Every structure is written in C-alpha cells, then in structure tokens.
C-alpha cells in the first residue's frame, strides 16, 4: 500500500481516536449540576463536528501546500527501484525543476499576501474614517456644552 | 533521499500538530460561548469555567498523546526505508535514465529567468503595500488616541463654580479650528503625526483644566 495512503489513513486514525477519547460521557461529567443533558449533548456534538471537519480541511491543505504525495510516491519508487536492482545534466535539470516549482509556489504566495495586505489597508482606511466621523460629532457636542455654559452664565 | 527522509516530514508534522492545537482552543472557546446561550450560565459560572477547564486539560492531553504517536510513526515508518537497500539504492538516477536535450536545458533556464522577473516585480508591490499599511495603522492608532481625548472632554462634568467668558470663547474658537483640522486629515495623505489636531485638543484640555482648577 502506498505511503501517501498509509499516512492519510494513519492521520485519520489519529483524529478519529482523539475524538473517541473526548466522548460525551466525559464532557457531561465535567458539569455535574446540569440537568438538560440534551443541551450539553448538542454542545458536545457541535464541538466534535467543528473540530473534526476543520481538522480534515486543514490537513488536506497542508498536504497540498507541502506537496507530500509526490514526495512519498517518489520514496516508494526509490525503494521499488532498489528492490529491482537487488533483483537485477540529469541532476542539473532536477534542481532546475525543483527551483521552478519553488518560484511558482512563491509567485502564488505573494499574490495572496499582497491581497491580504490590500484588504488590511482598506480596513485601516474604513476604521480611521469611522473614528473621524465620530470625532466630528463629538466636536459638535462639545460646542453645545460650551454654548450651554455661556447660556447658564446669563442667569 | 535524505532531504526527503530527515527534513521534509518535519514542517509537515509541525504544521499538523500546531493547527490541531489551535483548533482545540477555538473548539473550547466555541463551547464557552455556547454556554453563555444557556440558562445554566447565570446559575453556575464557576462550575462551567472549572469543568470546561478540566475538559480542556483532558482534550489537550489526548491530542498530545495521539499526535505524538502521529509524529513518531510518520518519521519512523512512513519517512523511512529498509536500510539493507542502502547499497542498491541508485547513485541518484530517477532522472538519469531519461535523456534531457540541450534545447530543453536552456528552455528550463528561460522559464526560471522568467519567473524570477515576475517575482522581483511582485516583491516591489509587497514593499510599497507593507509601508502603506504601516502608515495607515499608525494613523488609525493616532486618531483613536485623539478620539479618546475629546470623548473624555465630553464626559467631564461642570463642577459648579462660575466660568469665565474668555475661556469659553477660547474653547469655541479652538473647536472651530479642530473641525477644519480633522477635515484636513480625512481629505489628504496620511502623515506621521497630525500636529494641528493634536495641539488644538491640547488647548482644549488646558481650557477644561482651567475651568475645573481646584
């Protein structure tokens, strides 16, 4: 069975066993005074679903980001090849292949970072514009209070 | 091979465990928020905090044990090989059995010089953008500091002893000028320090210091 398959299967067994070891019964024991067992269970069920689904989504992404499958397939291969031999310019181009893979990763990463940057800016703009409109009407409110102090003086 | 065996697994493992931990604490925080939607919140705050902390300690100890089990098995079983095959393992020729023409070796060289052009350009944009954002942050923080200062002036109470008309006209004149200065901040490029805004507020604070002089 392939390495990449062995890993994925093990990583799923890890998660799935983690979840089995925080089961509802241990959750409910932490809150002895609660009588709506139903509410506690809905809460526990929403935890397990958030955690499990978010874990799987993140692990899928890291696996792609880090290019592990190709890598582990190459290892399987490198061991198949060795078995075959026990039975029975080039490394230039491989470096250049690896470097081009890297640049192309990097070009995708900086488009993303630069997008975050442009968005984070836009939020800084909007938050200072909001603080300024708040400033402008606080100023008007101070104006009224000072006129009011003058008006009090006439009595 | 040994890059793959000794180094490739590490950043993968670190990421998996680290994101698991983070998600466990987001999970726990979602649980705490959910409890605040229940009738049980008001009645039993200490029981809920302490139980949820006990459950967190357990959940963390479960993750630690199994994700360490996960770390071991990927380093020792997946990112490993039978060391008896060391001496049959190619002198590094997956690549070598396949001819690569001179045409293609210079073409790969072109596709590298081309993506190094794209990246240099994009890295200029990131620099320009990082500095823009550094400014807008400073400016936000500065303006919030100023907003807090006039808000404070708005929450001062008249502590009931006879205000002089020269001081109240001076406050009104400074408020007027502060409208203009705050208006200039919004319509123009952000500077390291909005000086006129800062000073007129300082005059306003001094005005109010004089009114409440003990």
- The CA–CA distances, whole Å, from A90 to A94, B3, B27, B36, B105 equal 7, 18, 50, 64, 10
Taking only residues 98 to 127 of chain A, the set having a beta carbon closer than 8 angstroms to any beta carbon of chain B reads 99-100, 103-104, 106-107, 110-111, 113-114, 117-118, 120-121, 124-125, 127
Q: Is B92 helix (H, G, I), strand (E, B) or coil?
A: coil
Q: Which residue has the tokens 């400014």?
A: B135
* CA A55 to each of CA B8, B49, B63, B65: distance values in angstroms, whole numbers, following the listed order: 21, 25, 12, 17
Q: Give the chain A residue nearest B9 (alpha carbons).
A: A68
What is chain A's alpha carbon radius of gyration, rounded to the nearest angstrom? Answer: 31
d(CA B98, CA B103): 15
Assess contact for B190 and B131: CB atoms under 8 A: no
Contacts of residue A113, Cβ cutoff 8 Å, sequence gap at least 6: B126
Please state, in angstroms and rounded to a whole number, the distance separating the CA atoms of residues B56 and B18: 16
Phi and psi, residue B167, nearest 5°: -80, -45
Q: Look at phi and psi of residue B66 and say left if phi exceeds 0, alpha if psi is from -120 to 50, else beta.
A: alpha
Question: What's the number of CA atoms in the CB half-sphere (13 Å) around residue A139?
Answer: 23
DSSP assignments along B133-161, one per residue? HHHHHHHHHHHHHHHHHHHHHHT----SS
Specify burial of residue B98 (Cβ count, 10 A radius: 0-12, 13-18, 19+): exposed
For residue A20, the surrounding DSSP H or E stretch is helix A3-20
Dihedral of CA atoms A122, A127, A129, A132 in degrees, nearest 10, equals -160
Cα–Cα distances in angstroms (integers) from residue B21 to residues A47, B57, B70, in the given order:
14, 12, 14
The pair of structure tokens assigned to B110 is: 């072109």
Whether residue B143 lies within 8 A of chain A, CB to CB, comes out as yes
How many cross-chain Cβ pairs, A to B, lie less than 8 Å apart? 245
Domain ranges of chain A: 1-88, 89-155
Question: In Å, how far from its chain's centre is CA A5?
Answer: 24
Would you tell me which residues 59-98 of chain A have a C-beta closer than 8 angstroms to some C-beta of chain B? Answer: 59, 62-63, 66, 68, 71-72, 74-75, 77-79, 81-83, 85-86, 89-94, 96-97
Residues A32, B47 contacting (CB under 8 angstroms): yes
Query: Using CA atoms, how far apart are residues A95 and A92, in angstroms rounded to an integer?
Result: 5
């Amino acid at each position: 069975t392939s390495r990449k398959e062995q890993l994925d299967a093990f990583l799923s067994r890890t998660l799935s066993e983690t979840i089995a070891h925080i089961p509802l019964e241990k959750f409910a024991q932490c809150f002895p005074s609660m009588k709506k067992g139903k509410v506690i269970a809905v809460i526990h069920q929403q935890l397990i679903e958030f955690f499990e689904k978010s874990c799987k989504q993140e692990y899928a992404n890291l696996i792609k980001e880090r290019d592990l499958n190709k890598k582990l397939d190459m290892l399987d291969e490198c061991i198949h090849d060795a078995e075959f031999r026990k039975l029975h310019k080039a490394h230039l181009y491989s470096h250049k292949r690896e470097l081009l893979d890297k640049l192309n990763q990097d070009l995708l990463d900086i488009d993303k970072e630069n997008e975050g940057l442009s968005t984070q800016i836009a939020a800084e703009e909007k938050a200072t514009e909001d603080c300024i409109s708040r400033m402008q009407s606080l100023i008007q409110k101070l104006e009224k209070t000072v006129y009011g102090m003058n008006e009090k003086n006439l009595a | 091979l040994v890059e793959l065996l000794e180094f490739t697994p590490l950043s993968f493992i670190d990421d998996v465990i680290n994101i698991t931990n983070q998600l466990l604490y987001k999970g726990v925080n979602g649980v705490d928020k959910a409890f605040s939607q229940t009738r049980f919140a008001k009645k039993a705050p200490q029981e809920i905090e302490e139980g949820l902390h006990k459950f967190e300690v357990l959940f963390e100890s479960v993750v630690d044990r199994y994700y360490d089990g996960f770390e071991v098995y990927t380093l020792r079983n997946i990112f490993s090989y039978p060391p008896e095959l060391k001496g049959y393992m190619r002198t590094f020729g997956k690549d070598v059995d396949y001819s690569i023409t001179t045409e293609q070796d210079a073409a790969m060289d072109q596709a590298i010089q081309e993506a190094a052009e794209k990246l240099v350009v994009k890295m200029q944009l990131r620099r320009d953008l990082r500095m823009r954002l550094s400014r807008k942050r400073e400016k936000k923080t500065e303006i919030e500091k100023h907003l807090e200062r006039i808000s404070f002036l708005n929450k001062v109470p008249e502590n009931w002893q006879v205000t002089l008309p020269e001081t109240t006209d001076f406050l009104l004149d400074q408020l007027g000028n502060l409208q203009h200065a705050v208006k200039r901040v919004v319509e123009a490029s952000p500077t390291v320090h909005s000086r006129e805004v800062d000073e007129r507020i300082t005059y306003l604070e001094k005005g109010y210091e004089r009114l409440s002089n003990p």
